[PDB]
């Protein structure tokens, strides 16, 4: 099974040249190619066959295929530039990876704030768990969320909403993480691990509290 | 490029058989395009279906290759999609689109919106979160009601029958694998306040006709 990957959120300052970069194994034997997607929109190809640009595609917009990285390169970065971008590389298969959320800084970066609360009582008492991580006041609207069992990344239960933007124009989000009351209880914590720009906040929890 | 135009219809209940089609404008079935069809569920990126070639071959994903046909109409350039056995994991955007020469999607489809209702009226589980005060500024605490499985939406929320405002936080709910809607309500009180002041959520699910005040008590 083959694999492209791309980190999920890039920032850049309006003016600056944004990097978005895509890896993997001998991509530089396939031919990439990049969409950006704005959003409820289709993805437009902005580039194909490693650096060529359709017509009507802004000369900004450049790419490139080497050392095994398939780069998409925005000089000049305009607000009209935030979208999702995605590569894409074909050898008579194709795969997509998993998208690049660029923001173009329109305020100073803000940290989230996150609370983690345990499973009540009386959900408990009816044979459910739930974990519930909120997450507010970030810019830009990009987080990643984890969640572990003790010190494990679980592998499953977790539904993570996308950032929503709240009235004072930074963003929020939550994640649950479901989990039977006998694993809640046979664990010593579980943490909510909320990563944004490069730093990460982890809340953890424990059944004895 | 070519101009390709989808249409389907997009509510369709689970464990059945989706059935979508798309019409190409300004090119012909020939030569080397591969007609394809890539998903994205709300949220999450692009994920490459199928492709079939004016001969009528096919190359699926084998994740669900078993359960999906593709087909042409090539005497009015028609594409189609058929996927069996589905969910509401199958709830996504689907896009039709060209793949050119060298492997590149030229042309794309607007796309079309696949909500399945696999789930139908549901009232909420309310259950109440604790006080902490371990990620609030000094002197306050976070309580909430955890507003769990309903469908469809809306919830709405207030607090001591609206006389409590300052300090809440309703976030929007997540729309879960399993088709139910989940959301959270916190507000940041005075910890002074948690032994003489009662916290009462209230909850109304007017699509269920449901109503419920959950009382938020600390815990020891
Ligand atoms: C972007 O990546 C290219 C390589 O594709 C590199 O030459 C260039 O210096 C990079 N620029 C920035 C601003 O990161």
């Known amino acids: 099974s083959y694999e492209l990957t791309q980190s999920p959120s890039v920032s850049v300052s309006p003016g600056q040249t944004a990097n978005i970069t895509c890896s993997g194994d001998?991509?530089?034997?396939?031919?990439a190619s990049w969409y950006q997607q704005k959003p409820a929109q289709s993805p437009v190809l902005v580039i194909y066959?490693?650096?060529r640009r359709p017509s009507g595609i802004p000369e900004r917009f450049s790419g490139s295929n080497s050392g095994n990285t398939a780069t998409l390169t925005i000089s000049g970065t305009q607000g009209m530039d935030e979208a999702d971008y995605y590569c894409?590389?074909?050898?008579?298969?194709?795969?997509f990876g998993g998208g690049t959320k660029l923001t173009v800084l329109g305020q100073p970066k803000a940290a989230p704030s996150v609370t983690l609360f345990p499973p009540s009582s009386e959900e408990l008492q009816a044979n459910k768990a739930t974990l519930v991580c909120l997450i507010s006041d970030f810019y830009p609207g990009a987080v990643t969320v984890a969640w572990k069992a003790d010190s494990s990344p679980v592998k499953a239960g977790v539904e993570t909403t996308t950032p929503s933007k709240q009235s004072n124009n930074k963003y929020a989000a939550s994640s649950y993480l479901s989990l039977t009351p006998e694993q809640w209880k046979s664990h010593r914590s579980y943490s909510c691990q909320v990563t944004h720009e490069g730093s990460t906040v982890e809340k953890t929890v424990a059944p004895t509290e | 490029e070519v101009q390709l135009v989808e249409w389907g219809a997009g509510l369709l209940k689970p464990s059945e058989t989706l059935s979508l089609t798309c019409a190409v404008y300004?090119?012909?079935?020939?030569?080397?395009?591969?007609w394809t069809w890539i998903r994205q569920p709300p949220g999450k990126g692009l994920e490459w279906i199928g492709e079939?070639?004016?001969?009528?071959?096919?190359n699926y994903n084998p994740s669900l290759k078993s359960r999906l046909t593709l087909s042409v109409d090539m005497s009015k350039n028609h594409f189609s999609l058929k996927l069996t056995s589905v969910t509401a994991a199958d709830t996504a955007l689907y896009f039709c689109?060209?793949?050119?020469?060298?492997?590149?999607?030229?042309?794309w489809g607007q796309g079309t919106l696949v909500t399945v209702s696999s789930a139908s009226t549901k009232g909420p589980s309310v259950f109440p979160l604790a006080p902490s005060s371990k990620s609030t500024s000094g002197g306050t605490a976070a309580l909430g009601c955890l507003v769990k499985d309903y469908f469809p939406e809306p919830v709405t929320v207030s607090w001591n029958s609206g006389a409590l405002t300052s300090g809440v936080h309703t976030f929007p709910a997540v729309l879960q694998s399993s088709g139910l809607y989940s959301l959270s309500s916190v507000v940041t009180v005075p910890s002074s306040s948690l032994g003489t002041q009662t916290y009462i959520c209230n909850v109304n699910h007017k699509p269920s006709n449901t109503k419920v005040d959950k009382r938020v008590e600390p815990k020891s």
């Open positions: 894409q590389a074909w050898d008579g298969t194709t795969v």
């Open positions: 001998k991509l530089g034997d396939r031919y």
């Open positions: 066959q490693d650096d």
């Open positions: 079939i070639d004016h001969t009528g071959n096919t």
């Open positions: 689109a060209r793949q050119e020469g060298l492997g590149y999607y030229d042309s």
């Open positions: 300004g090119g012909s079935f020939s030569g080397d395009y591969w």
